[PDB]
Design a protein around this ligand. Structure first.
Ligand SMILES: CN(CCO)C(=O)Cc1ccccc1
Lengths: 300, 237
């Protein structure tokens, strides 16, 4: 069980760790989060009390280094940093734990929610979407635009999701225009799965990461990417059975976790109605269709 | 964006553009089977592709053989239309290719956009106008060449005959749309008006009769009356 200590908390902030969140008052004696489960990526995220504009945070994996948070009063945010001195770090944490100045990652034993949301998400792939190679952790915020958004403006601060465009030469074989547009299997299976992602695990990892950035940061380009990756599968007549079954599980837990009061903005009516009721896979997403109908029947 | 009343004069500027109407591509007669079920029989159709500035009409005849063994024909018809329009554009020299293609029905947008991916600079546009190009098969010489086709065939006509020697392309388009609107609202009357006078003939190389300028004013008036008349008989006004 790993720890992310905080030097201090000088400004009032709501802190998220994965799907949990807690309030810290200005100058409250808070020194971090302990008992973080090893084996998953995690995200620690921030919304200041005085300017709820800009949610921001850091994707990290405690297996890749010792990370801590320190507020920077010049740039005005909580920054993640890596501590290279292992003995300094262990001693800092041990002191903070001894004074009980840390919150405990509060994982109920029965609960597989975070695993189910990050099953295919891997730090190494996050770091190719979010390019900042000098750090082992990845910063994301509400305003960062995606490469595709930038084609339609600072390249260094972009989300490099895989571009998916259904009316593009990449998606449409010369001479198969109608076929490829109405049945996207060749774009899914040959261009994207075999060609770009190499396997469905990497495809699902990007889809899950896009959803989590949409949900935790209100990142609009991430929401677009999540829906595009769903629609590409649902609009393909030929999908491996194991991918459809896994997709249904992936989406079930995403819809389960989504805050009820954010569904209006985080869920695209056209995509979901098309996917659940018109598409080739309208009959292949039983768990997802059941939770959607019982939890968001208005959207449909 | 969409073509409508506000930007109507753009049709007659010097940027090459084409209207594409797919109404008459997939045509059927509906009939009863021996067992008392209903079935369709396809008849030859056509794509109506028109340069409104010059009167150039590329009439691609759609022979019923293109439907043989195919499913979802009304959907296929849109993609076939898009395939043929794309082939026409590729067949034209670069300096003759359109800068815009305006589709008369919005369901042509995605099929044509996908077939034209190779031409990212050609704008594919809808229109809010209710253009009467479906009535093209009420022009006797066009209907005749479509029904007689035994194979796929492109036939070329200026739909304005020689009118541009005497009038502008705005006025010519307005005459054409008035004639076609009349033929669409009451075909028999419209054709009675056009041929009532034995002395005015259609030249072998033309579609419409050889009216003098003054006769065109009379004709145009009779067509507007017809479109108002029928509008009363329809709405009881
Ligand atoms: C083809 N001819 C005579 C046949 O009507 C033209 O009047 C020019 C033309 C070129 C191309 C398309 C339509 C019209």
């Amino acid at each position: 069980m790993n720890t992310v200590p905080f030097t201090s908390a000088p400004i009032e902030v709501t802190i998220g760790i994965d799907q949990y969140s807690f309030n810290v008052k200005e100058n409250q004696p808070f020194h971090g989060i302990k008992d973080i489960p090893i084996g998953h990526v995690h995200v620690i995220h921030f919304q200041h009390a005085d300017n709820s504009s800009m949610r921001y945070g850091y994707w990290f994996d405690c297996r890749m280094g010792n990370f801590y948070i320190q507020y920077d009063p010049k740039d005005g945010l909580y920054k993640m940093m890596e501590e290279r001195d292992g003995a300094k770090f262990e001693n800092i944490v041990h002191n903070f734990k001894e004074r009980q100045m840390m919150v405990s990652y509060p994982k109920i034993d029965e609960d597989d929610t975070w695993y189910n949301l990050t099953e295919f998400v891997q730090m190494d792939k996050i770091r190719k979407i979010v390019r900042k190679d000098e750090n082992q952790f990845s910063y994301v915020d509400s305003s960062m635009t995606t490469v595709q958004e930038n084609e339609l403006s600072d390249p260094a601060h972009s989300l490099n999701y895989t571009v998916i465009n259904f009316k593009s030469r990449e998606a449409i074989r010369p001479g198969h225009e109608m076929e490829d547009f109405l049945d996207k299997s060749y774009y899914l299976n040959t261009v994207m799965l075999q060609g770009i992602f190499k396997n469905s695990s990497n495809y699902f990892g990007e889809l899950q990461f896009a959803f989590l950035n949409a949900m935790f940061f209100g990142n609009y380009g991430s929401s677009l990417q999540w829906h595009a990756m769903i629609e590409l599968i649902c609009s393909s007549a030929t999908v491996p059975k194991h991918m459809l079954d896994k997709l249904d599980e992936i989406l079930y837990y995403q819809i389960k976790t989504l805050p009820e009061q954010y569904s209006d903005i985080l869920l695209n009516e056209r995509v979901w109605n098309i996917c659940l009721y018109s598409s080739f896979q309208k009959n292949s997403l039983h768990n997802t269709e059941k939770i959607m109908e019982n939890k968001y029947p208005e959207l449909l | 964006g969409a073509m409508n009343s506000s930007n109507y004069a753009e049709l007659f500027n010097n940027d090459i553009k084409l209207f594409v109407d797919d109404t008459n591509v997939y045509r059927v007669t509906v009939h009863k089977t021996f067992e008392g079920n209903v079935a369709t029989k396809a008849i030859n159709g056509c794509i109506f592709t028109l340069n409104p500035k010059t009167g150039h009409l590329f009439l691609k005849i759609i022979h019923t053989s293109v439907w043989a063994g195919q499913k979802r024909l009304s959907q296929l018809a849109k993609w076939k239309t898009a395939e043929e329009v794309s082939a026409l554009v590729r067949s034209l020299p670069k300096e003759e290719q359109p800068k815009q293609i305006i589709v008369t029905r919005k369901a042509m947008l995605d099929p044509l956009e996908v077939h034209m991916l190779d031409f990212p600079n050609i704008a594919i546009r809808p229109t809010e106008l209710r253009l009467p190009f479906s009535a093209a098969m009420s022009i006797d010489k066009l209907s005749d060449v479509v029904m007689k086709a035994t194979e796929p065939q492109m036939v070329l006509f200026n739909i304005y005959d020689d009118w541009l020697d005497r009038i502008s392309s705005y006025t010519a388009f307005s005459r054409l749309t008035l004639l076609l609107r009349a033929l669409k609202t009451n075909e028999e009357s419209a054709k009675m008006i056009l041929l009532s006078d034995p002395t005015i003939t259609i030249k072998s190389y033309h579609l419409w009769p050889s009216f003098t300028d003054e006769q065109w004013i009379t004709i145009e008036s009779q067509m507007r009356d017809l479109i108002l008349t029928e509008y009363g008989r329809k709405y009881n006004v």
